[PDB]
Amino acid sequence: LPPAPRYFQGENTAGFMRPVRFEGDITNLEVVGEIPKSIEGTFYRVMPEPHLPSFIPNDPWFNGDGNISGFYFKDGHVDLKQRYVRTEKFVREAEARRSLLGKYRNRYTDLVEFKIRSTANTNIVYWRGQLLALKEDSPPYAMDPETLETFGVYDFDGQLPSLTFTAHPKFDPVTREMVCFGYEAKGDGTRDICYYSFGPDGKIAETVWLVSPVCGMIHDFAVTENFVIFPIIPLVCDVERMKQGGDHWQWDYSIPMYIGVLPRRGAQGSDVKWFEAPHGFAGHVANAFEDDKGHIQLQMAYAKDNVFFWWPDANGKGPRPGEVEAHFANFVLDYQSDKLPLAEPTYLVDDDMEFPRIDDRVATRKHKHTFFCIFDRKPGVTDFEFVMPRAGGGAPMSNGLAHLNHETGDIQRYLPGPRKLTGECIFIPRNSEAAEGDGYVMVLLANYEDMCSELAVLDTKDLTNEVALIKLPVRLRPGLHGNWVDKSDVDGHPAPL
């Protein structure tokens, strides 16, 4: 077997990216300022965090074992519980005390045969009294929201029709449905998309098999009252490349950014229309809705080049680190149209942005508030000379949050400071009566001065001001997605506006 390193090496595990790999509890976190005493619930987030040094040099950030953080808030007090998802990979590597899973989404490089290759490291959502730890190459792993115990790989009472479950399911606040899909839904390199939904009682509702024009990465999707929308990142899979030890994903400069539209209910696979947006990178969906004329307004991060630059084209052509900006785009789609090519999108702000969140009380409907990460290169905002030598590599950088009011066009920007960066934020309704986008925003900060993490609590009345700064004495490595589960929501999801 290729030897197992006994300590982490390489930029992807240097400085703030160095794995900590702790599981357990820190109760009564230190607080500067005051956590509003009416906040009650849990902020769950997932980070990739390799449990053992990889035998793959410069293993991408997306290949690290999913470690779940819960921040449990009550009466202005907050406790941290932290635990790794017990994936097949985690358990067998813990047993062997060495890495066994090889390259990102390439089973031909594994040192043993895995049934499930999930790192469960992308998103952590609440569904019918369980957490679901998501990774788009796999079914979910079900976990206990209170103890973070892993129950096991989850197949929805044997109803899961797909080998894959997206990291970005949508929760319809009116129907209480979880709207899902998986791509490569029949295995490596398949063009099968399985679109499926679950009613609030846990019974499968929709199941539609459709076919992607290419085997492309469908990381996120969008749901409106009557449609589901599949934006394809022009990263393309060739299993023959994988069998020779090559990358699962390879950029294709020659294809459009496909945007598939399928009727939400009662459709067959052949009903999908593959619209062709100008070539670019499909970033995260803020939200989509039908306007009065029944046109789909799809609002999402959109870049003009390969954000995942470590997977370039067949000739190694691609951007450098920190070169590609993504912009908050509005695409207009008409399912009735037979024109496949789409206009350039309009842009809602100028900021280099990503990780958009809305008030999920209006998910699939007209939203007028978006909270998102921004990366501002304007001199002074980030002390790059101090931060970059401490930052390591492999993870995106965000040096603020912005709140866009879509009606007034007003933008508020939160800047944690010149030696801090942010993760993805969550939005918390002030209470069950609160107006759209009124309440609290929380975001995890990397503090490069202390080499510690902090959890910032902001009031939407003034995003520029920290109401509380929760001071962790450890690092939480830069992570991916997270969700708020309010104690007042019995099913874990907020009530429709």
Add this chain to the structure above:
Amino acid sequence: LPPAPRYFQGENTAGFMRPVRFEGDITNLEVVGEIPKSIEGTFYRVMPEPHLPSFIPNDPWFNGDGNISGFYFKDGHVDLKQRYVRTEKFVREAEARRSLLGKYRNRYTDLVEFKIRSTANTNIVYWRGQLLALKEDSPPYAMDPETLETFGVYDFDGQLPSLTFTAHPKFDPVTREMVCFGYEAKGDGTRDICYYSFGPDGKIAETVWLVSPVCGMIHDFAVTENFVIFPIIPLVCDVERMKQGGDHWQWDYSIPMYIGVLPRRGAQGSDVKWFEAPHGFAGHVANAFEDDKGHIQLQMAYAKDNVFFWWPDANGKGPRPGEVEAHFANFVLDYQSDKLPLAEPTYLVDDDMEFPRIDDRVATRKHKHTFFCIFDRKPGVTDFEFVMPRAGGGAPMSNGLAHLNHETGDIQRYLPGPRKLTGECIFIPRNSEAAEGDGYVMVLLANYEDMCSELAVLDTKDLTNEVALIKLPVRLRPGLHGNWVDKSDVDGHPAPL
């Protein structure tokens, strides 16, 4: 109630002294070099680590909640398990989410009435399949060696005769007895010492009540084949001072360092002889033994002034921080003598030293190896300019270990480096055949460059060289005592030489 602060303030909780307060697991610790594959067992250490900010300003380091670290070694792999002792204080404060216990050893300052005031934060020893978490004002807390679960306050099957159990019991390697005492054994300010022992079957053997000439701190003691020896630190307790909110302990410049000698077996309290050593501070006992003439050779750290300078005399007179040195002293005692005053001791090395360990296979008998902490002010050994601003306050500093061979007089010094400090070391016999003092030394390092802890593994054949450096990604706050439990020892203690 006096308000509970929501974050740590004061020098005692700044820099490397900032509480982390994590409980749980970090498995498969990063290793630079190679842990000898034949090492099998667990290094247990305890640190004071306040779980909640004190309402007492500049609460001394000795008043922090005991947090137990276990380093579990097998086949060159090591895992950390970390858990707080569930003392009455820990449990009630966790319930209230605020500090309730007041000043060090002063119940008159507590915000509620405690039955047991233990922080269980001084030593962690193995006895008949349990850990005992020790604090000299209390009975032990019994814990599970594998899970670090707290069973509860331990009374040895109802046999414990004393309110108090020393942090420094001695394990007789020939008789397999645990030799114990407690001072203030009948409550605050009592001069009662209870000397007691347990046979390897768990049955109490000795129980002798005697009387201290003053109510003085008896932190450590010594055991030989035929004697037990009680060195009294000239810190003296007045309950009337405590009732007004004053300190439990106050230096008395006017008394000798009393050294009581009692026959080990069959004695009455009146059989104690209170020898009078020159005024000074009784530091930790390395070991004591009888020579051929049956005279006690007592080897211990000894200073000429108050090491615990934060508890000065009645007029606030005493040393400044970093002023008092302790030296490795040999006192000679003859139980037969009626001369109470004792000569100045001889000194075995010149180093400012403390935390002496021997090969416990010769405990209570002639030893010829001692391992100890040194503090060397020789320019360059510690980069004080870098370390002091990052160190916080309240804890002693050690910038190396020394191995003294008592036969050859050879000293080897381990220097972890200019920006690292050490805790108390443990000694591990190479195997059950190994000569006295032959095997491995482990010591926890504070790395002020990384603000991380490391666990150094040294071979006694060359103490200057790290065979392995285990790299923790978190801080373990400076702690007190620790012990090795070898997997090859059925009762957790090594076999006699």
